Design a protein around this ligand. Sequence first.
Ligand SMILES: Nc1ncnc2c1ncn2[C@@H]1O[C@H](COP(=O)(O)OP(=O)(O)O)[C@@H](O)[C@H]1O
Ligand SMILES: [Mg+2]
Lengths: 754, 788
Amino acid sequence: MQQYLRLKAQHPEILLFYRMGDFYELFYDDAKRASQLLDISLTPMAGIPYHAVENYLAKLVNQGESVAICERKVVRIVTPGTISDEALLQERQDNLLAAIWQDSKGFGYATLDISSGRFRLSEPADRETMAAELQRTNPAELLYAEDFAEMSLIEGRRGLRRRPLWEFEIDTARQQLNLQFGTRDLVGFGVENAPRGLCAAGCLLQYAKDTQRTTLPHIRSITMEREQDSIIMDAATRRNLEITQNLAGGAENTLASVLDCTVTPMGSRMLKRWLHMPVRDTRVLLERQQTIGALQDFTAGLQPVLRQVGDLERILARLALRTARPRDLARMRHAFQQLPELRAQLETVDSAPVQALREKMGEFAELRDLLERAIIDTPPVLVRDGGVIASGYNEELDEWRALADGATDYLERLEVRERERTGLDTLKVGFNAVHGYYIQISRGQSHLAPINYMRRQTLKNAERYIIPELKEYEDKVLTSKGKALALEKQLYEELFDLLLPHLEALQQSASALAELDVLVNLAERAYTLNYTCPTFIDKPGIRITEGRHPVVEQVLNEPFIANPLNLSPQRRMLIITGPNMGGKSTYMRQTALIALMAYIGSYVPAQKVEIGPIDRIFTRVGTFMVEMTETANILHNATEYSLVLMDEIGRGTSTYDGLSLAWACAENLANKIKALTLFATHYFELTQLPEKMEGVANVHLDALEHGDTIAFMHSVQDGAASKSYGLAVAALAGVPKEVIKRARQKLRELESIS
Amino acid sequence: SAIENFDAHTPMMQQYLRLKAQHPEILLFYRMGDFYELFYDDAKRASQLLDISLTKRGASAGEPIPMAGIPYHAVENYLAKLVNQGESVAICEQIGDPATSKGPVERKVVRIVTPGTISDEALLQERQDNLLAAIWQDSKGFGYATLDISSGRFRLSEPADRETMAAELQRTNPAELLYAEDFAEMSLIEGRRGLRRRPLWEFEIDTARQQLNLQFGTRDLVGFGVENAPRGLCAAGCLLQYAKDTQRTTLPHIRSITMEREQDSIIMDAATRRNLEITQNLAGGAENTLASVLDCTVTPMGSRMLKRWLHMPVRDTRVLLERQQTIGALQDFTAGLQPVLRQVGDLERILARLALRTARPRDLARMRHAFQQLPELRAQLETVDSAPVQALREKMGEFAELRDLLERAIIDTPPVLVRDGGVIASGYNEELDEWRALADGATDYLERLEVRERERTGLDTLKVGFNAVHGYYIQISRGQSHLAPINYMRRQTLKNAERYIIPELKEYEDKVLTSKGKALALEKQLYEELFDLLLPHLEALQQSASALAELDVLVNLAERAYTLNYTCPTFIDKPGIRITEGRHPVVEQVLNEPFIANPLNLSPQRRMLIITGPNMGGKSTYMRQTALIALMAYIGSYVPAQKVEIGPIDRIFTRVGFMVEMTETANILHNATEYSLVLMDEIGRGTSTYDGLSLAWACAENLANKIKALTLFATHYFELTQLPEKMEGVANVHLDALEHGDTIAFMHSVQDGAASKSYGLAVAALAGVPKEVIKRARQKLRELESIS
DNA sequence: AGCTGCCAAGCACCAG
DNA sequence: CTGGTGCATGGCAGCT
Ligand SMILES: Nc1ncnc2c1ncn2[C@@H]1O[C@H](COP(=O)(O)OP(=O)(O)O)[C@@H](O)[C@H]1O
Ligand SMILES: [Mg+2]
């Protein structure tokens, strides 16, 4: 009652689940905090049932809360970034731990996926790149120094963890890292001279190790993510492009929702990492392209088999951590049994990279056979109770089970002997913890129980008895069952000793298999959805013949209107007039997604695409202050290799201010930055730009008025727009006729000056 | 699939399927012994929803029947989970006696828990109404009716068009919505929770009239002012039928219905309710709302009333003057009254349970506690000079007789349920004391028998006990049980003990048990009798709770007016608003820096203000605070200014800026009058430069020329600052800002005339746009300024 | 104080 | 017809 307080002092920053019979119960500010986060009641007490702790842990873990469980003492802790149990994770989403800190120079950043051992490090130069890395990686738990000056970056996030500055010390970090990987220096990983990144990585690794209190043999590498390697996209751009998340917070009507028909959870997670990290290096890209074309035919044969491999990545983490439960080993075995078939289907594929994926996939004949012999066809969830080791694997175990079954058989025949011998049809032998084995007669017959029967328990409508004969065989049964259970466990632990020396090759296999899932999926998508392989050019350019928006074309059952685009150094900017209504916005967004998909190595939705090198993609599409802030970010960071998409800036202030800013932005983008730009606008005055300056041109969307409506066509045409539609839309909407007549008069007089 | 005709089924499932056929779309809890049972798909869904095992009930012919269930004593926890997810549940109980039934015992559905018909304290939120509504659409309009079942408040309206109806659904936010099958305007209603499609015949007018008249004890509905209102009666008739089928008892707290006419209140459109953040902020939460600031009531029933008032400003001048006078009269009495009023609690909802015959012992206890506060309240209120307050004091009643009854009937802190007894107090019923006397000369008797028999046998482990399964016993340990009297009759054997019975203990077992059941039966009969004695006074009781709720509300507005520095507004004959040193009641309490008070002068000669000023300058706030001040004035409340004079307002419209803007605008243009307050916040969107502005201009014209509404017109279009020149009624005001050096300061002060200039370039500059780009845009701007 | 397993009260089922 | 057995979740006896 009183001894909760002292144990809450031991871990004050973490929710304290306190065992109390059938529930775990929280008090003080833990009670308040848990009641609001879990839709359960306050009293200051709260509670959850034992049978569904893991179901409530996972929701608290999902919202950034660590949880200490007190069984007395704190015997378990789960932190949001360091879980690896399947019950606590989402199958198709990464769950990362991260660490951030700040020099007078710049930022250091590390992420770890504790289930795959995927360990990354980076060194963002400034505020904006740092924020872009946080949105992209979206860590479930975020370690930061007490020192941290730029709290604006992390303030709102879940799972913040304030750490002392000495956890970020260079030399401790190097030593910890060199020890984890078994190296003398980090040159082999290309991070030796990246001290900011390393300091973050040393804090992260220390915190991971302290949460597990176990070696982490699956974390054998770290890699550095350099800015120049990827197409940079800021938070706002990422969100607007609706890559994995839609604007409304969901996962549907998203690029992932269309491109992601992978068949294994590890493949779905890898695909989403690729979509969020397009790379500038055409070499990787052409190689992915070639794989996708080469696998076109083999797709229907590959995917059903690949689905049976399952989430080998996360199973392997539990092997590494030595928490892998029997059905984990059963599914690892099930995946090993897919490998030969997969190897046979891939043998033909004329593709150097598919053949490398084929080798790296491996076979593991020995381990397949080991687990075939070692474990039954479908074992229970836990080793705990046995019935998991297969008969014929250990001579000793088969013998103990035989002695148990033979004692148990004698007792069933004892039941039949005592029964027909006494003439009592209700007579039977049962078993429970309180009495072990007993003979049960019903009340009504119990008064004819033989006098040698020692009564031990009266029930409402039966009596139970023991005899020495019954207790003798109980001993045989329980001591046999008991040694067999201890043997099962020791044999199971030994499977871990035999499996674990092949961990490195096994992680290489699950990675290959995950990649194969991604590429085989993208191949099925390209072939299915009528995509085409884009080509790369030396100079900045985008030439698209009949491009579509990859999401909108699947998601609406209206025909989708494909469109050209021609951007070069000689034609760098299009001023897009006409109604928007989603037509311009869709056209600009589909441009960015074709760029993104090209630079992920996927085929693209078009008859043809040629595309030059892109460093960054900016899409300001969707207060005045925020439009202007995002515009400011484009004008400070865009280059002649950037793709810029602006959506009618100037809205939200005066006509002349709005037009002056738009004109000065359009001109800056065209003559100073020279970025490749689609500048959507409502200002007809801006269509005079092509005649004042080189490299700019007018396109537009039009609309046809028929019947009692107006069809907003989505066809992009050359030249400026020569009609507006605000008044036509107001008329349809029921604005009184006399008001529109007056608006039309007013419109003519305002426009006739300009 | 098995052909499961009637004859193929067992008597149990014959009975169950007849019952389920009367509740085909909703879960049925079927009482079978100690369990509520669900079958077939109900079992599978219950299993998913409630987290319970899906099992089977064996069958000799045909298929095995899917089953899930809960023991009867756990039912309330399970109904709560279901009601939270908007599920309805038919509760079916056993009526007959199994011992005198050859076949299955008789079973009826005795209630149906649905999201809008709950009245139990654990299933509701203290400070939020939970309404059942019904909606109906005509060739020409809407019928709508609401019921708060846990108060009896029954309302009827006839919104004339789509937007009024939308605004009504937003204001009332029904937890359950019964609608007619031929409803055409589904956009109003889909994606609403607790949606219940109903057959047309449930909205038939003669049936409605007939049921409502039957319910109220009347021949016609003339005295209620709804005889006139068949569109509304149809919705009300459906509602009343639903209420009666869910509760399956009489509903004597539903003694009245009232029509809500357009003219009796200020109709706020949907955008206005949202944009003023009355009880919900613009991100769905309750923080930083008008209610969060104004609502320091001390009773749940008063909290709800205050929110209903905030949502329905009244236009009756007399009612408003009375509330205003109450607020001034009571200002010194707030610190005294509030701690007492708090102790009354939620008498409203308790009397609902009383009416429903559902009230638990702690309900009658709290009702008794409330009666005990009435004397102290009467005394505090006699001194207060105010006819309205004295009217409430009298309405509040005293109920000395019923207070006395509950003090004699029930113990001080009774248990949660009457099921286990221990509720009725000593001395109230002599037959009950007489029965208690027997099952109580009990543990004194059993200790005596225990010591007597231990000392007589000389067996020192001998104890006396009870066990629900085997009854009373004499226990002796295993090692001493071979020494027990030969008289001792073996009753129950255990591992290390043996339990026995003797005739004297068996007789004492029979007398204690038959008398414990007799005492419980009589308690239950006396407690049901408590209802029969309270119920005849239900009308006055309901009026007392209403008074207490109003008192709570008004006392609160007094305290708020004092603490937050509000003054009494005055009303005038003609449309107009005159504010001196007015403030946004909510923004001024959250801002960490002083609030800049601002004037307003609207009148029939000065009825439209074009408001300019920079982005972040305070235009929206100024417009909102105007509406909030009107709103508070028209609930009787004092108001956040130094002085306010305001004429009659029929309706507040808001448009805060594609087909939706233009449709909303048209609605304002078709339905505004010279008595309407209209807030247009930066409207006018088109596809080209002037397209949208031209519409805003023509719209302003129509508002000034034809409608003559009091209109506040925030705009970024400088071209509209020319409107005063061209049209009577229109004037320019602006929010002051100063540009010193390289930067803008926002003064937040309204001044007459057009702003000096627009400030988009400066705002863009402040947002980080490169200096080089701001230089070039200034150059372009001066080209444009040289045109005119 | 923890863990296991009987029992509630209707009804149908199942062998004899 | 008889005398037995199954059957959800939660209460708590009975054993440790
Ligand atoms: N009278 C006032 N005194 C102090 N601050 C104010 C006042 N009115 C508005 N503000 C502040 O200025 C900010 C912007 O106000 P807003 O009405 O939205 O300006 P606008 O509509 O012109 O863009 C608000 O956050 C509010 O806190
Ligand atoms: Mg505004």
